[PDB]
């Protein structure tokens with residue numbers, strides 16, 4: 042520990058604690074920058090040298106959070122709740138959280154080693170065909186691509202069986218040990234369990250109830266969608282393997298976790314005679330290039346009179362693919378270095394209509410970072426953890442439209458045909474609405490484990506209960522408590538909350554509606570854009586400047602006017618497809634929901 046990074050002495054006063062907050066701030070951006078700089082380099086190009094620097098940076102960060110966290114508890118754990126500023130209470134409350142650093146070394150060293158071991162066995166999971174094969178598969182590319190692409194039911198089944206079998210089972214012992222150790226650490230931090238810690242972020246005493254009220258508002262839309270897809274699969278696979286009343290076999294939905302079904306959009310799409318618009322042909326013809334694209338993105342924000350990208354951003358960012366042959370993580374990401382001056386993007390840009398849209402949300406994050414850089418570093422995070430991605434997405438929504446592309450000049454004429462825009466809304470539904478029930482059930486399920494209400498003998502039973510209950514899926518081959526299908530997801534062994542994403546996808550439209558309402562727009566909400574609309578920016582800026590200083594429920598209210606989440610706006614946005622599906626289901630007599638829930642298909646005749 043560098044002494045300039047090691048806390049001093051502070052009184053039990055607020056007057057002292059204000060000085061503690063100030064000192065933590067000044068040290069914090071000096072450590073966090075050094076940490077993120079290393080992590081930036083490692084990700085900007087892989088080298089074992091940079092991986093080492095990455096590893097050392099990780100240790101240096103934890104060592105810093107520890108050295109301050111221990112004193113924050115030692116001096117202010119008896120007090121912090123008392124302090125007059127809700128901003129300061131937020132500052133100290135964040136520092137005062139220690140997480141795993143509560144565990145004594147013996148447990149601590151098991152804990153880290155245990156968490157890493159889960160990630161290893163998941164990331165390095167494998168499936169092998171039932172021969173003396175030279176070669177096995179892995180989740181990507183082999184499994185993701187066979188599962189999404191092929192539709193011979195047996196082959197599709199085996200791929201799903203192998204994965205949840207191989208990825209889950211060897212996790213089963215580890216995840217229990219994690220659950221115990223996880224809760225024990227937070228117990229000392231001040232939470233009943235890890236689950237009550239995660240829910241602590243949304244600072245809502247009624248949080249879990251709020252979700253069910255939201256999800257109940259979605260269920261008519263989701264059931265409408267689910268019931269529609271279910272019929273389509275019946276056309277394809279046969280009467281033996283689908284029940285027009287029952288739930289859907291989990292592996293037919295085109296995705297290993299059935300969390301988003303878009304890979305059956307090719308099979309289901311409405312109005313097969315219409316195209317789906319691709320503006321790439323203009324963009325290449327215009328001589329657009331990656332470097333230019335961001336200036337369009339910046340144009341948008343400047344058009345809202347949000348802040349332009351500072352010169353440092355143009356000096357630093359890796360907008361284009363590198364000139365070297367060096368290996369790089371191409372997946373697009375946006376970075377804030379807690380050093381106030383320089384913000385950074387990595388995009389690996391390929392000039393296509395899709396990545397044009399993608400750049401806008403990635404720059405959206407940068408605009409978000411730019412606005413709250415003025416806060417003390419402890420607060421420089423989204424008003425709540427899903428709130429940051431929402432401000433990212435509302436931007437991509439607007440520009441994805443044909444309406445905005447015409448103001449960009451990339452589109453020649455607007456073509457207001459509902460058959461086309463239904464195609465667009467429906468594919469987006471198969472992407473994101475299918476995700477809401479899944480995103481909801483996981484963190485109910487994990488809360489079930491962390492609260493203990495799912496003891497280890499029920500990990501798998503409570504999982505499939507939650508799947509059929511919410512997502513309308515059932516397992517393709519009988520699954521029993523030796524298996525552990527909850528582990529087969531990325532976010533479970535990586536102990537990463539999904540609930541942020543669900544909260545975000547509701548805040549997304551709850552903003553978009555409140556912006557388009559403010560931007561003077563009227564008409565079909567998916568045809569709104571806010572570009573050039575200074576009225577939207579000035580209100581949007583008020584959200585971004587708040588960062589996390591002000592409780593999100595108060596900030597959201599100041600933007601939208603509602604003290605809480607609501608899915609009515611989301612239903613407004615999807616309204617056109619909502620109506621269309623209701624017609625199509627009514628025409629087919631399709632039974633919404635899934636009675637005969639106690640059904641799942643027989644096995645293929647010679648399996649395998």
Ligand SMILES: *[C@@H]1O[C@H](CO[C@@H]2O[C@@H](C)[C@@H](O)[C@@H](O)[C@@H]2O)[C@@H](O[C@@H]2O[C@H](CO)[C@@H](O[C@@H]3O[C@H](CO[C@H]4O[C@H](CO)[C@@H](O)[C@H](O)[C@@H]4O[C@@H]4O[C@H](CO)[C@@H](O)[C@H](O)[C@H]4NC(C)=O)[C@@H](O)[C@H](O[C@H]4O[C@H](CO)[C@@H](O)[C@H](O)[C@@H]4O)[C@@H]3O)[C@H](O)[C@H]2NC(C)=O)[C@H](O)[C@H]1NC(C)=O
Pocket residue numbers: 327328329330331332333
């Ligand atoms: C990615 O795309 C970027 C943008 O490209 C342009 O725009 C897009 C939409 C497409 O249409 C592209 O095809 C198009 O090229 C590229 O940056 C641009 O690169 C080109 C070529 O390298 C630049 O063109 C050259 O610019 C010189 C400077 O011209 C400006 O400054 C003069 C003073 O020096 C001034 O007198 C001019 O009026 C001009 O001012 C610009 O005005 C327009 C509006 O009228 C603004 O939009 C600009 O921002 C203004 N820029 C400034 C600095 O004020 C010219 O001297 C030069 O002409 C000479 O060279 C050409 C060959 O290049 C000869 O053919 C010609 O005869 C003459 O001798 C030429 O115009 C362009 O300026 C760059 N953009 C900017 C903003 O500077 C990226 O390089 C590209 N990257 C990749 C990898 O593709």
Ligand SMILES: *[C@@H]1O[C@H](CO)[C@@H](O[C@@H]2O[C@H](CO)[C@@H](O[C@@H]3O[C@H](CO[C@H]4O[C@H](CO)[C@@H](O)[C@H](O)[C@@H]4O[C@@H]4O[C@H](CO)[C@@H](O)[C@H](O)[C@H]4NC(C)=O)[C@@H](O)[C@H](O)[C@@H]3O)[C@H](O)[C@H]2NC(C)=O)[C@H](O)[C@H]1NC(C)=O
Pocket residue numbers: 066067068070381382415416417418
């Ligand atoms: C969390 O902790 C950070 C870091 O300690 C605090 O930032 C510091 O806050 C104070 C108060 O806002 C700020 O002082 C003001 O800075 C303005 C710019 O001052 C710069 O120029 C003068 C000369 O004109 C220098 O004397 C200063 O040291 C500054 O120097 C420049 O700083 C930038 C930013 O880091 C750096 O990139 C440049 O390299 C450097 N210049 C050169 C030539 O190297 C003044 O206009 C104003 O009057 C005040 O002096 C101080 O500069 C901040 N430092 C940094 C590093 O950001 C945060 O305030 C704190 N958080 C909160 C919420 O308080």
Ligand SMILES: *[C@@H]1O[C@H](CO)[C@@H](O[C@@H]2O[C@H](CO)[C@@H](O[C@@H]3O[C@H](CO)[C@@H](O)[C@H](O[C@H]4O[C@H](CO)[C@@H](O)[C@H](O)[C@@H]4O)[C@@H]3O)[C@H](O)[C@H]2NC(C)=O)[C@H](O)[C@H]1NC(C)=O
Pocket residue numbers: 082085086087088090091365367368
């Ligand atoms: C990924 O990005 C990083 C940052 O841009 C980049 O880092 C540099 O990589 C090169 C090698 O490709 C390093 O060069 C050598 O590093 C070794 C130690 O690992 C040193 O022994 C070498 O010392 C000589 O060169 C010095 C100047 O670099 C001289 O001052 C010295 O006297 C010796 O003559 C040499 O430094 C370089 O150090 C790193 N730098 C950093 C900051 O990481 C890396 O190259 C990129 N990846 C790829 C594949 O290019």
Ligand SMILES: *[C@@H]1O[C@H](CO)[C@@H](O[C@@H]2O[C@H](CO)[C@@H](O[C@@H]3O[C@H](CO)[C@@H](O)[C@H](O)[C@@H]3O)[C@H](O)[C@H]2NC(C)=O)[C@H](O)[C@H]1NC(C)=O
Pocket residue numbers: 049050
């Ligand atoms: C932060 O506050 C602490 C507690 O008020 C200060 O700690 C004290 O620091 C002095 C030196 O400034 C230490 O002196 C040592 O005392 C022992 C005898 O106990 C002697 O053998 C050593 O040679 C040395 O003189 C003292 O131990 C230490 N006491 C405690 C309880 O921490 C500290 O000075 C303050 N920080 C700063 C930067 O001033």
Ligand SMILES: *[C@@H]1O[C@H](CO)[C@@H](O[C@@H]2O[C@H](CO)[C@@H](O[C@@H]3O[C@H](CO)[C@@H](O)[C@H](O)[C@@H]3O)[C@H](O)[C@H]2NC(C)=O)[C@H](O)[C@H]1NC(C)=O
Pocket residue numbers: 151154155158
């Ligand atoms: C994380 O997973 C790894 C791998 O499963 C665990 O490390 C393994 O630990 C065992 C002993 O605990 C090692 O087996 C022993 O090896 C020695 C020779 O080194 C041998 O004499 C013993 O009879 C026994 O076979 C095993 O080699 C070791 N594997 C690796 C790769 O290190 C680790 O304990 C797990 N940690 C947690 C927290 O789960």
Ligand SMILES: *[C@@H]1O[C@H](CO)[C@@H](O[C@@H]2O[C@H](CO)[C@@H](O[C@@H]3O[C@H](CO)[C@@H](O)[C@H](O)[C@@H]3O)[C@H](O)[C@H]2NC(C)=O)[C@H](O)[C@H]1NC(C)=O
Pocket residue numbers: 206519520521522523524
């Ligand atoms: C939960 O369901 C699984 C199947 O999905 C059951 O596991 C399977 O049980 C049978 C009977 O023991 C195993 O067959 C045996 O395999 C061994 C080779 O491993 C072979 O030597 C025997 O002759 C016999 O064929 C089968 O392999 C096994 N599968 C797995 C993946 O373990 C399990 O029994 C069910 N749970 C409970 C509690 O019964």
Ligand SMILES: *[C@@H]1O[C@H](CO)[C@@H](O[C@@H]2O[C@H](CO)[C@@H](O)[C@H](O)[C@H]2NC(C)=O)[C@H](O)[C@H]1NC(C)=O
Pocket residue numbers: 123124125
């Ligand atoms: C910190 O907590 C204490 C205890 O809840 C508060 O002290 C009490 O304050 C009320 C009026 O605010 C008095 O009627 C009590 O007599 C006080 N009790 C004691 C033991 O002093 C204190 O006000 C809180 N501080 C803040 C800033 O809210």
Ligand SMILES: *[C@@H]1O[C@H](CO)[C@@H](O)[C@H](O)[C@H]1NC(C)=O
Pocket residue numbers: 457564565568
């Ligand atoms: C598209 O045409 C319909 C015609 O009924 C109209 O109601 C709708 O508002 C048009 N789109 C926009 C963005 O105005």
Ligand SMILES: [Zn+2]
Pocket residue numbers: 402406430433
């Ligand atoms: Zn994002």
